[PDB]
Design a binder for this molecule. Structure first.
Ligand SMILES: CC(=O)N[C@@H]1[C@@H](O)[C@H](O[C@@H]2O[C@H](CO)[C@H](O)[C@H](O[C@]3(C(=O)O)C[C@H](O)[C@@H](NC(C)=O)[C@H]([C@H](O)[C@H](O)CO)O3)[C@H]2O)[C@@H](CO)O[C@H]1O
Ligand SMILES: CC(=O)N[C@@H]1[C@@H](O)[C@H](O[C@@H]2O[C@H](CO)[C@H](O)[C@H](O[C@]3(C(=O)O)C[C@H](O)[C@@H](NC(C)=O)[C@H]([C@H](O)[C@H](O)CO)O3)[C@H]2O)[C@@H](CO)O[C@H]1O
Ligand SMILES: CC(=O)N[C@@H]1[C@@H](O)[C@H](O[C@@H]2O[C@H](CO)[C@H](O)[C@H](O[C@]3(C(=O)O)C[C@H](O)[C@@H](NC(C)=O)[C@H]([C@H](O)[C@H](O)CO)O3)[C@H]2O)[C@@H](CO)O[C@H]1O
Ligand SMILES: *[C@@H]1O[C@H](CO)[C@@H](O[C@@H]2O[C@H](CO)[C@@H](O)[C@H](O)[C@H]2NC(C)=O)[C@H](O)[C@H]1NC(C)=O
Ligand SMILES: *[C@@H]1O[C@H](CO)[C@@H](O[C@@H]2O[C@H](CO)[C@@H](O)[C@H](O)[C@H]2NC(C)=O)[C@H](O)[C@H]1NC(C)=O
Ligand SMILES: *[C@@H]1O[C@H](CO)[C@@H](O[C@@H]2O[C@H](CO)[C@@H](O)[C@H](O)[C@H]2NC(C)=O)[C@H](O)[C@H]1NC(C)=O
Ligand code: NAG
Ligand code: NAG
Ligand code: NAG
Ligand code: NAG
Ligand code: NAG
Ligand code: NAG
Lengths: 170, 316, 316, 170, 316, 170
């Protein structure tokens, strides 16, 4: 996509993540752990949802028969009707091909975008207390236990607390 | 020592298309083009009239098979292939226009023209049009000379529309199988039938001559019509060969008319109909039938157009 | 110690729609669908002809009310509801086609057919068509038998178009109220009126008969027409019942024709017109009238479609 | 939006900013101060403007009457005309709904984008002389007076001048 | 000490348009609107019939210039401006409908009606229709009274379609230059020509009268037609003035018909044709001709619409 | 564009780069050197290519004549046909103007995007071993020879090797 996270600096997706669209895996003294992020997952879901509610629509626009399957109408008017109907088929087939291609390009870039947002939101929380791996990973200098991890997810992680020790560990 | 961000993925994704690419695999997607048809006319909650053997136009003139449809009332009108507008062989001039008027009519209400006659037969009949033996169009009168070969006296009949809506007036011209048959029914001489309104002007002549027998008759009745405006008059002046209306018709309101080959079903509701049935769908497009009518998804050529509802699928 | 980036916001934003959302609030927006109508025909800087009582088709035949419109010239032609094409009751065959030709004509120029006559009355008149007592169509001649019941001698009249543009030729067939009235005017016998060109072939017969009185007349005049090409000839052969053209018409150039119920106004300029007036707008769309003509914004069903002209509004 | 600044890492907008679309508030020894950024404001304005000039258009495409309000045309041709007109109403209503939704999605993401550009342009000026707050704020280690602030706006701010003192203040 | 990222650029870029801007310069772009025409009919690999002097409708009736096109067979049919449907002056009723049928026909196959005659001339001819002296339509028969002024005996002729596809039936009504000429050919009295099917009902009368001479003839032959369904019958009953079909026509399959003024060329293949030639293009749009037919790019008003195929060009 | 690299923090393009769309110039002890990046160049090319293959299409949708240049059809039906054709010209002219404007906006933002991806991919490789110039330039503290440069392009550059010396050179 445009933002370069999904099928980008992230190598690949996680078949193990079943609670959301985006999440975190960590490694620390106590072990490994995965968890879904509700906020990022919700924005994407709600937006894709909003798309569907616009498109899964049908008009209150009625049309009646202007020709006849049982007794053919006069040939000249018959051909003008067919020509017009075929002209409309062409227009709507184009519209529909484009609509869907345009929406899909955008849906994908929306997903790619929501990840990139989540990435950099965390980055900023950490400040000088961690560095950028490049594969979607944040290496932490100070050791960070499972309570310390849940505070990162919660957006309650206090960088100043662990700062001194992490900066000396540059 | 570290924390890592990621996104979900699945084993089996679904392919979609984009501006830039064909066959991009995404986590989930959903169809925007309807392919599923219901092979019935879904008529739940609608006043329906399935004409069956009766042709739409026959509801106005009244051949035997339309005896139960002379004053119908409907939200949805269903024409069938086996339907026929006539008993005695013939045709409506401007026939499709009238059908379109009738399909959208909500049904019809009738009133007598109040035409009386004297010194003529009023009761012409045929075996082509049978109701326990020979009969005729139930709304029409076959006007004849009293006795064989007798001259048809030059008549003038008139009808004013006293109603607030327009009236539908019908008449017929009879074309005998031969000139000698024409003289037998309405006396000899070149017959003129005149018809006029404030909105409308026309005239007609019969055309006796050999035709192939249809319902065992080589004669023909041409039916004509006009829409008479509120508080306007129509005058019929005729030497003969003339099939007079017994009643005038009035439109009840609004309806939708369709043509179909499948059954009615009151268990199923739908607003998009075609000859093969009903398209029940929320989707914006459909690849089922380009002549579907009602409130339909738009017809498109593509069999499928998948709309992504998930991110790009990137498994290991 | 620090510096902070930000963006603007407002107290009262304006809601718009997006691909993903309905009712997103943005700083500012602007309407793309026109709802404002001017209830006048904005004719500033245009040669205008408001036909009023004169019907468009009447400019060719010339009933009293069209006496001032026989050779008009225009950029914009305005038909009115009260307009009438006729004095003596009747109709044009192919009437809407001719109107379309005339609406786009830029006006008309006339030239005499140069038809002379002998041993007949040329001056037929009626009270239905009055100019200080009884008169007739100003461009037409009601041709009669010299005296009552006299036979109408078999005539042949012809006209060649010597001009570089096509000519508009008109004639009329007269249908008497009765057969006996027809014989009185043009003698007895079945009357044939023939009309031919190199491009065109047709024939006509009268149809005497009772009709409801319109302008106190139960007779009728059918008007017919054709477009004669440069350096082609038309021949009229007639037993009678025939209303001959006195003049031929030629189109001046280009115009636009409209139908309206509102006043002319030379203070206001516009190119999109409809019966209720003028749509003056730069916007791409309009929800005012789907039959607007001229150079118009596209008609759409939506009452409003707001185009964002500012960022998302995020107040505290 | 896609970039995640507006209704993103910035909490909310500033009703006080009346000189432009984007700007800076600072805090220092001399006091607080707000100022609009001309460049970022101009790019957004000019682009939204360019949009309007494409859409606020009308064709030189004339159409004439093909029917009649005063004397109805023949019913068959009348119905074909109505069917066609209604078909065109459907197409243009769709076009217009889509056009506006597509343009609005893009207009919003353009505004969100111009902010994110301005953010990171400043970030780069500062280099190691400041850190990222996360709320759209750049904490400066070295003390920076009102002349020092105007040089940031001007794009004349010399990072090397204040570097030594700010890096030691890590 | 350092490394720097960058992108390419060119001296002379190409301007395109965007949602936001007009005239943005990009590295490279490519045209989406076709302006290049091939001034020939590109017919490579297609069974082509260039009618030249023969008019499409003339392939059914057979005037001299259509003698080589009576049973043609084609994928692509080319009508020319100089083409004419007739030798003896006249016209087809419903002419454009029939052309549309024939353009899409794939060609025609003929079969005899099997009509024999007795006690009449069958061999009428004219100098307007010459094949080494005077002749007539090759598929038609000019039926006359045996001798001058002799009465034309009241005939009835019939034809059943035994084929699985519909037949195309044609006949003609002859209108003499004068009433006295009509009596000479088919005896005096008002002539009636009747024509009927199970699907179709109509009648005709001649109309003798003066017209301008076309091919040195002031008479006219009106041609009429109908599509007879499989296993249906048509009956012709006639007092005279009647031009009978000698053969019936059947459609071979599918074709495309065009009108053009340029040459055929079998070196060049194309599916989008117009009067000025062929549009050979992969592009989605074209600004060449709005009446192009076949499989065409969509016609648009813009002369050019450049699609960017490169980044924004930013030189130093 | 949306990402703000091309006609953004990069001053201008390089007429000297003829092997690709994106690349690197470096300065070091051995001299200056330019080189095209295959990956970034390929993604843009393939995507713009994919666009062309969708648009450079034509329907299998045939249409026949419904009127006549040699013998005008009846005027009423003639005017309905013209009205309809002109209605279709209007629709397709709009479609085409929009399609191309929409695709071009996107093509430009795609190019701008692919650069920004390439930029930040490198940034992450370097980590604390270099700083951000702001003009699209990465100033390196440790001296980096031509073998060291080719490892940056190759994505084989080992940041940990040169770390100690570069961090001390802060
Ligand atoms: C030589 C001989 O005696 N032959 C008869 C033969 O006439 C007869 O057929 C008759 O043919 C006439 C048409 O010429 C009609 O079709 C007769 O039927 C009816 C009908 O059923 O429609 C009878 C009906 O009462 C008539 N009604 C009126 C009001 O006139 C109509 C009417 O004349 C026609 O429909 C108008 O076209 O005709 C039909 O019996 C055959 C049997 O078919 O017997 C031979 O012996
Ligand atoms: C028993 C008796 O005497 N009754 C008369 C009655 O005839 C007369 O009405 C006349 O009715 C005729 C139609 O039959 C016409 O409508 C007469 O009017 C005119 C007209 O104004 O149009 C007079 C005009 O001079 C005539 N012109 C020509 C060229 O023929 C026309 C013309 O014949 C018709 O228009 C053709 O259809 O008719 C009208 O006076 C009434 C008064 O209405 O008085 C009774 O005593
Ligand atoms: C006073 C005098 O003798 N004048 C003749 C003059 O009649 C003659 O012209 C003739 O005009 C008639 C129409 O009235 C025809 O046009 C004659 O030509 C043909 C034709 O070529 O078409 C001859 C042909 O054999 C006829 N065939 C049949 C089957 O009838 C047709 C046919 O009658 C008409 O086409 C039907 O409308 O007419 C034509 O010679 C001139 C020479 O033109 O010579 C004068 O002396
Ligand atoms: C207009 O199109 C319809 C089909 O959409 C044509 O009707 C079909 O004709 C074919 C072959 O003649 C039949 O096999 C089908 O059963 C018909 N389908 C329907 C739905 O009617 C019609 O012929 C075309 N119009 C003209 C004038 O040819
Ligand atoms: C085609 O549509 C027009 C309206 O767009 C119909 O004309 C209207 O008819 C209604 C009800 O009959 C009248 O109340 C209106 O005054 C008419 N409006 C206009 C603008 O003419 C018309 O009837 C439709 N065509 C057919 C054949 O029914
Ligand atoms: C419909 O449009 C066509 C043009 O697209 C008109 O035909 C043209 O008419 C002009 C002026 O009368 C001629 O100079 C051209 O040679 C014609 N061009 C073609 C391609 O036929 C046509 O007149 C219009 N229809 C009506 C009823 O006016
Ligand atoms: C995926 O989309 C389809 C719509 O076709 C839906 O029915 C299905 O339940 C969806 N699955 C998930 C996991 O959202
Ligand atoms: C017909 O007459 C009645 C009163 O007798 C009136 O209510 C109605 O409006 C009239 N119609 C017209 C068209 O004048
Ligand atoms: C907001 O937009 C409207 C257009 O409807 C304009 O007239 C108004 O002056 C605009 N206000 C500002 C502050 O740009
Ligand atoms: C009619 O004749 C004149 C010369 O007398 C000529 O200029 C004009 O072109 C002719 N028209 C045609 C169609 O031949
Ligand atoms: C630029 O695009 C055109 C298409 O019009 C193409 O023919 C040309 O070779 C292209 N040039 C390059 C360098 O890709
Ligand atoms: C006509 O008759 C033949 C058999 O004689 C039959 O095959 C064909 O189907 C018939 N046509 C119809 C329409 O019944």
């Amino acid at each position: 996509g445009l933002f370069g996270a999904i099928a980008g600096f992230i190598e690949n997706g996680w078949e193990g993540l079943i609670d959301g669209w985006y999440g975190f895996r960590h490694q620390n003294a106590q072990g490994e752990g995965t968890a879904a992020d509700y906020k990022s997952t919700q924005s994407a879901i709600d937006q894709i949802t909003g798309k569907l509610n616009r498109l899964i629509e049908k008009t209150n626009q009625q049309f009646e028969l202007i020709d006849n399957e049982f007794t053919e109408v006069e040939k000249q008017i018959g051909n003008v009707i067919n020509w017009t109907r075929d002209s409309m088929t062409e227009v709507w087939s184009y519209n529909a091909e484009l609509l869907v291609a345009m929406e899909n390009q955008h849906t994908i870039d929306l997903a790619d975008s929501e990840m990139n947002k989540l990435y950099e939101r965390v980055k900023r929380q950490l400040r000088e207390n961690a560095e950028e791996d490049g594969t979607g990973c944040f290496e932490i200098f100070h050791k960070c236990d499972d309570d310390c991890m849940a505070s990162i997810r919660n957006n309650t992680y206090d960088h100043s607390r662990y700062r001194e020790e992490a900066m000396q560990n540059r | 020592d570290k924390i890592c961000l990621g996104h979900h993925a699945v084993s089996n994704g679904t392919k979609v298309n984009t501006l830039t690419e064909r066959g991009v695999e995404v986590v989930n997607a959903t169809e925007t083009v309807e392919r599923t048809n219901v092979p019935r006319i879904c008529s739940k909650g609608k006043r329906t009239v399935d004409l069956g053997q009766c042709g739409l136009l026959g509801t106005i003139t009244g051949p035997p098979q339309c005896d139960q449809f002379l004053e119908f009332s409907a939200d949805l009108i269903i024409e069938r292939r086996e339907g026929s507008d006539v008993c005695y062989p013939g045709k409506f001039v401007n026939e499709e226009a009238l059908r379109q008027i009738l399909r959208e009519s909500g049904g019809i209400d009738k009133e007598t023209m109040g035409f009386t006659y004297s010194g003529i037969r009023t009761n012409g009949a045929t075996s082509a049009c049978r109701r326990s033996g020979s009969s005729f169009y139930a709304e029409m009168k076959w006007l004849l000379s009293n006795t064989d070969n007798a001259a048809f006296p030059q008549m003038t009949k008139s009808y004013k529309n006293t109603r607030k809506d327009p009236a539908l007036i019908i008449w017929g011209i009879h074309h005998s199988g031969s000139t000698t048959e024409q003289t037998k029914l309405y006396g000899s001489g070149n017959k003129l039938i005149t018809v006029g309104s404030s909105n409308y002007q026309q005239s007609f002549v019969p055309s006796p001559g050999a035709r192939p027998q249809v319902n065992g008759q080589s004669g023909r009745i041409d039916f004509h019509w006009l829409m008479l405006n509120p508080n306007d008059t129509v005058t019929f002046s005729f030497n003969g060969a003339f099939i007079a209306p017994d009643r005038a018709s009035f439109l009840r309101g609004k309806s939708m008319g369709i043509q179909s080959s499948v059954q009615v079903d009151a268990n199923c509701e739908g607003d998009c109909y075609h000859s093969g049935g009903t398209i029940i769908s929320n989707l914006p497009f459909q690849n089922i039938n380009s002549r579907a009518v009602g409130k339909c998804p738009r017809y498109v050529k593509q069999e499928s157009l998948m709309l992504a509802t998930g991110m790009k699928n990137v498994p290991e």
